[PDB]
Amino acid sequence: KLCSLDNGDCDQFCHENSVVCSCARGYTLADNGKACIPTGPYPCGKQTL
Amino acid sequence: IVGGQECKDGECPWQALLINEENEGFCGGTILSEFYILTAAHCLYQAKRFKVRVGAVHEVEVVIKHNRFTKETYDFDIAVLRLKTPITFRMNVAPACLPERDWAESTLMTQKTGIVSGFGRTHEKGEQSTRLKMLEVPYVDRNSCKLSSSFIITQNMFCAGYDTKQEDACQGDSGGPHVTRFKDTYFVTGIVSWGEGCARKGKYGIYTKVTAFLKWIDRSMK
Ligand SMILES: C[N+](C)(C)CCCN1C(=O)[C@@H]2[C@H](C1=O)[C@H](c1ccc(C(=N)N)cc1)N1CCC[C@@H]21
Ligand code: NA
Secondary structure (H helix, E strand, C coil), X not given: CCCCCHHXXXXXXXXXXXXXXXXXXXXXXXXXXCCEEECCCCXXXXXXX | CECCEECCCCCCCCEEEEECCCCCEEXXXXXXXXXXXXXXXXXXXXXXXXXXXXXXXXXXEEEXXXXXXXXXXXXXXXXXXXXXXXXXXXXXXXXXXCCCHHHHHHXXXXXXXXXXXXXXXXXXXXXXXXXXXXXXXXXXXXXXXXXXXXXXXXXXXXXXXCCCCCCECCCCCCCCEEEEEECCEEEEEEEEEECCCCCCCCCCEEEEEHHHHHHHHHHHHC
8 A cells, every 4th residue: 555655655665554665785874764875985876977 | 679779888887899800799688797798699600709898898708608598599598608708896897696596486487577778770670789788677577578579488488578568688689688677786687588570469579587597597606
């Protein structure tokens, strides 16, 4: 239910009650439990800018 | 790539190129990590010997091709290459993300479009591109695709592209990336697999469905 509406406000992975967000390898879940923060200069899936 | 546009510098950094002994490209790949490249199993039959170019040239240590690959249907068209020397990430050289399977099925595969890229032919009966190109391809309804196709479409394949509009991947792009953008992050969703010609009317591009192989990929990268 909840992940099917704007992805539960998660930046990346959403699972369900309540919403639980997670992130790909090389990212850390932000304090807000929604956003995904890179750990290095070349995280996966980002264009190089 | 027929149609689409050239990638800006840094816009398509996960692209790899498989090159023969004379430094001529014949297939694409996707950077997954410093040591691993995703490509199509059918690309393993295109040259006697090959290496991988990013952006630097890297030799292959191990070829891990799917045990169920069939040349007749292109079912299970997936391989992973482990490189002898690690890739240095830098401008134009960075990996695409591997999604979680459940989320990828429910959320990525249900986006309207993905992005295919490569150095392959710019017309079915034309020449390869010197510059890297990209193309946004709509996901295509499975029933629509089965209706269009002279050959079997399995659960390990999906279709993307256009019915009549003259844009598609082509010879020399195969093995290359199909990625899906989700809030500015690009996830691996496909491998350029096959098509009946390139950009033909009433025909789509056919892609290896990566969601079917996420466990297999994790196992192969250990
Ligand atoms: C599935 N069956 C066996 C019926 C058709 C395979 C034909 N052909 C190839 O052999 C590969 C692949 C392809 O479709 C491939 C290819 C991949 C994608 C497209 C496209 N999207 N238009 C076209 C050709 N060719 C380029 C380099 C090798 C060949
Ligand atoms: Na078409």
